[PDB]
Design a protein around this ligand. Structure first.
Ligand code: WGT
Ligand code: CL
Ligand code: MN
Ligand code: ZN
Ligand code: ZN
Length: 455
């Protein structure tokens, strides 16, 4: 009556046969899981990667967090904890909060209590946590190559479900990206304590994500399917409009805690789960999610993109343009990079890339015709992929340019995409230059190579 828990999301227990190939399995459950936004995966009982670490030599800098509903927080980017000293702090905190041993505090109660304390202005509970990509002071919880390994660790070295491997796995089109986009393709490590929370969000470029809980107390999740993303945003806009004022950077995105019952009252479908140690949660493209930790724990998560995602990735960049939001990478650049490697591509990949490329080319044709009729006549080839990203964003909409852009000798170094030709400066169009990566005649043979590889 104070808190009504959302219905449970789907839970999968694949056989060893199904579990062998992660991407085939994900594709299998997709028609179910994409209806709920999140889903949980229980590995076969055998599958138990060796977690081993020294709690005294792993150090990290803690982030601090206030727990207030609808209050703005900034997406993550001093002091120092070891894994042991943080664990001691976290267990003492939970123990003193409930005056109970930690394992006897029911998960139902922590959930009820979380939503009570974030709503009450009178309570000012703050908590700490760890969040960073893997490094020398604190590294992956999965086995990696270096130090000699035991026969069990090397079994799990090349698993698909070893999350270090999906940044470079082939069915993930993110693997082929040449640009170092560390924040996005490398795994993040998360050290939780009781009530530490991740706000409502979707992934950059509407990618998938996958989260593994290595050990410790459970992680509670709320998820919304991708088809309801904009319903959720309209509810958020009405109840907390400050979160929507234009962000200066992509290191200035604002997010918040919000009760799922509030969303359910406004007809947004929400699902929940408790993720325990040894379990995976998977999020689908544009599926909103949030949650909190029940106690001291350690998780590891990574973004990825299947061939299924390619059309959504294009729609997402279009959506970023309307919103004037920064991109993490150029989607078109990624497509052309794969086309240029067509001979070594997986054939299903090749077929799906070909379809996206065909849309890209037809859209680019129409845009070039439009700017020609605006009086832009001069043109020159330009290798956009050699420019630092901050040197090739459209002045107006902030999109990362790759296929083409307009420049002018008047504003040296500035660019606009072909949608915003009128937003560069006050000179007449004949002083402008179309800068392009490829002619249409370069592009049709690149697409043809994909067609041949796909057969
Ligand atoms: C509070 C510890 O972090 C977590 O539990 C997280 C987070 C984040 C925490 C802080 C920023 S983003 C994302 S996904 C997950 N499991
Ligand atoms: Cl509060
Ligand atoms: Mn996420
Ligand atoms: Zn000018
Ligand atoms: Zn633009």
């Amino acid at each position: 009556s104070m808190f009504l828990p959302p219905p449970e999301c789907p839970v999968f227990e694949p056989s060893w046969e199904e579990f062998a190939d992660p991407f085939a399995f994900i594709h299998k459950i997709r028609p179910i899981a994409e209806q709920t936004g999140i889903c949980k995966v229980r590995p076969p009982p055998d599958w138990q990667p060796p977690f081993a670490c020294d709690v005294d030599k792993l150090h990290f800098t803690p982030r601090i967090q206030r727990l207030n509903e609808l209050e703005a927080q900034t997406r993550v980017k001093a002091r120092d904890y070891t894994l042991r000293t943080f664990g001691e702090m976290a267990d003492a905190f939970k123990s003193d909060y409930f005056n109970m041993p930690v394992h006897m505090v029911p998960t139902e109660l922590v959930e009820k209590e979380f939503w009570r304390l974030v709503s009450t202005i009178e309570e000012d509970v703050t908590v700490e946590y760890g969040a960073d990509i893997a490094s020398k002071e604190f590294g992956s919880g999965f086995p990696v190559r270096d130090i000699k390994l035991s026969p069990e660790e090397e079994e799990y070295l090349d698993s698909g479900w070893n999350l270090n491997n999906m940044p470079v796995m082939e069915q993930s089109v993110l693997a082929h990206i040449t640009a170092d986009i560390c924040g996005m393709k490398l795994p993040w490590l998360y050290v939780g304590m009781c009530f530490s929370s991740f706000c409502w969000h979707i992934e950059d470029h509407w990618s998938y994500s996958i989260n593994y809980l290595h050990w410790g107390e459970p992680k509670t999740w709320y998820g919304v399917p991708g088809y309801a993303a904009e319903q959720l945003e309209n509810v958020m806009k009405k109840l907390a409009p400050e979160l929507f004022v234009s962000q200066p950077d992509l290191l200035h995105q604002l997010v918040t805690i919000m009760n799922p019952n509030t969303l359910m009252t406004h007809e947004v479908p929400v699902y929940r789960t408790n993720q325990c140690a040894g379990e995976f949660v998977i999020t689908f493209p544009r599926a909103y999610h949030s949650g909190f930790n029940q106690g001291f724990n350690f998780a590891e998560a990574v973004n990825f993109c299947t061939v299924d995602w390619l059309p959504l990735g294009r729609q997402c960049v279009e959506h970023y343009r309307l919103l004037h939001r920064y991109c993490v990478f150029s989607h078109d650049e990624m497509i052309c990079k794969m086309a240029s490697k067509a001979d070594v591509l997986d054939v299903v990949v090749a077929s799906t890339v070909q379809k996206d490329m065909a849309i890209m080319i037809e859209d680019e044709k129409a845009l070039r015709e439009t700017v020609r009729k605006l009086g832009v006549i001069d043109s020159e080839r330009m290798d956009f992929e050699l420019l630092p990203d901050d040197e090739r964003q459209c002045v107006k909409c902030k999109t990362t340019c790759f296929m083409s852009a307009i420049s002018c000798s008047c504003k040296p170094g500035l660019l606009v995409c072909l949608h915003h030709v009128k937003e560069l400066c006050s000179c007449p169009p004949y002083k402008y230059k179309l800068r392009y990566r490829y002619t249409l005649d370069d592009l049709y043979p690149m697409m043809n190579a994909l067609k041949l590889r796909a057969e």
